[PDB]
Amino acid sequence: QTVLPFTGIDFRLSPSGVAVDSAGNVYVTSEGMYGRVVKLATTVLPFNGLYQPQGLAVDGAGTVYVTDFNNRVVTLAAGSNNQTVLPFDGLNYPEGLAVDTQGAVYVADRGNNRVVKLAAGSKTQTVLPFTGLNDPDGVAVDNSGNVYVTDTDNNRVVKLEAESNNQVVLPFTDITAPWGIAVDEAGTVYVTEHNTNQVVKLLAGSTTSTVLPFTGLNTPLAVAVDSDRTVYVADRGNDRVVKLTSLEHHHHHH
């Protein structure tokens, strides 16, 4: 277990989201009235007008996607100084955000109890056929197009299967108010919760989740997983990002 050196900044880090790109750069949303996206290669990315930024994601091209409480999703192409606003419509306190391998953008529109999707280049959104959501917070999408959502106020993690289009509840053990979510290349789902200061995982097809051996955690809000399967957690209560390196047999990938 390692604390990332987010040093050389004036402001309180106040992490609300974490993401890792191809090259191991780590991106964090810094949640204040003045919002920022910070990158540890420490730089503050040139986003303008972020107000309490929440979820973020980064795709294979290095484009960074961020939701905030001005009810929008903004993107910044790699290197660019001009953000664009994606044409989502009618968001209400969007929290988690995910981007799939085809560039579609998924937003947990928490205030509207829904997950909305915008295909790449599109300008009309679709509401995904989830049922019975109640203040959903985190969203993730795996390589097969399965969508996972932390349905926070129903104390469950749901998965919209791409093959059946049916919603199923994943067997996480005694989960309460799940918040952050991420999915890795093997379909392992990682979740944080408001209730317990634990980060838990569930292997694909497994019947029991396990607790990851992090130690110092206070209020883990966000989780990300890199291609080595190292896990990163926004440990909000201690103003830091912690990572837990995977076993060596996971550090081969192409």
Side-chain angles (χ1 to χ4, degrees):
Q1 178 181 307
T2 304
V3 183
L4 274 40
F6 276 93
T7 278
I9 54 165
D10 352 79
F11 52 92
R12 205 196 264 290
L13 177 66
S14 301
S16 60
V18 61
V20 187
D21 67 13
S22 285
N25 296 312
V26 180
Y27 304 77
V28 165
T29 41
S30 174
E31 206 201 7
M33 308 152 163
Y34 201 109
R36 294 168 176 100
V37 176
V38 186
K39 170 176 165 177
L40 175 62
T42 317
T43 57
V44 182
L45 257 55
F47 282 102
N48 307 303
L50 304 176
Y51 169 61
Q52 311 283 8
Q54 301 303 322
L56 58 14
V58 54
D59 67 10
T63 298
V64 175
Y65 301 75
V66 192
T67 63
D68 79 346
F69 283 180
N70 282 341
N71 300 334
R72 50 198 206 145
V73 177
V74 297
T75 73
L76 196 72
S80 179
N81 267 240
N82 306 334
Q83 68 197 38
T84 106
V85 184
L86 296 170
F88 284 98
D89 163 63
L91 299 174
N92 186 21
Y93 301 109
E95 299 243 10
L97 176 156
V99 187
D100 75 15
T101 52
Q102 255 249 105
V105 178
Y106 298 77
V107 175
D109 187 12
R110 187 215 79 224
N112 290 323
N113 298 327
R114 62 179 192 171
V115 179
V116 302
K117 180 194 176 164
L118 189 67
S122 190
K123 49 196 176 103
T124 80
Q125 74 195 14
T126 57
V127 180
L128 286 185
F130 280 108
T131 45
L133 300 184
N134 182 1
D135 288 284
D137 194 321
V139 66
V141 59
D142 66 21
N143 285 330
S144 315
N146 303 302
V147 188
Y148 306 85
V149 180
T150 54
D151 190 16
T152 304
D153 284 355
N154 288 326
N155 306 297
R156 73 189 176 157
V157 178
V158 300
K159 168 197 187 189
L160 181 61
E161 300 177 323
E163 329 80 47
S164 61
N165 285 299
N166 288 329
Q167 166 177 310
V168 309
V169 175
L170 301 188
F172 275 92
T173 307
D174 292 330
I175 201 107
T176 292
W179 258 348
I181 189 161
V183 65
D184 75 18
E185 55 189 287
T188 296
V189 175
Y190 302 84
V191 174
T192 70
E193 28 187 329
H194 173 283
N195 199 51
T196 215
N197 301 322
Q198 290 170 336
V199 179
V200 314
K201 77 167 149 172
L202 187 71
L203 309 173
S206 175
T207 318
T208 68
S209 51
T210 59
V211 177
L212 291 68
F214 287 102
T215 56
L217 303 186
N218 185 347
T219 319
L221 316 182
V223 61
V225 63
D226 69 18
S227 59
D228 287 343
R229 312 219 191 150
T230 289
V231 180
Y232 303 77
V233 179
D235 190 19
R236 174 54 163 281
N238 302 312
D239 262 289
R240 60 182 193 162
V241 177
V242 177
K243 74 163 167 183
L244 186 74
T245 57
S246 48
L247 294 181
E248 198 54 45
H249 59 252
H250 287 297
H251 302 180
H252 188 97
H253 42 75
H254 45 84

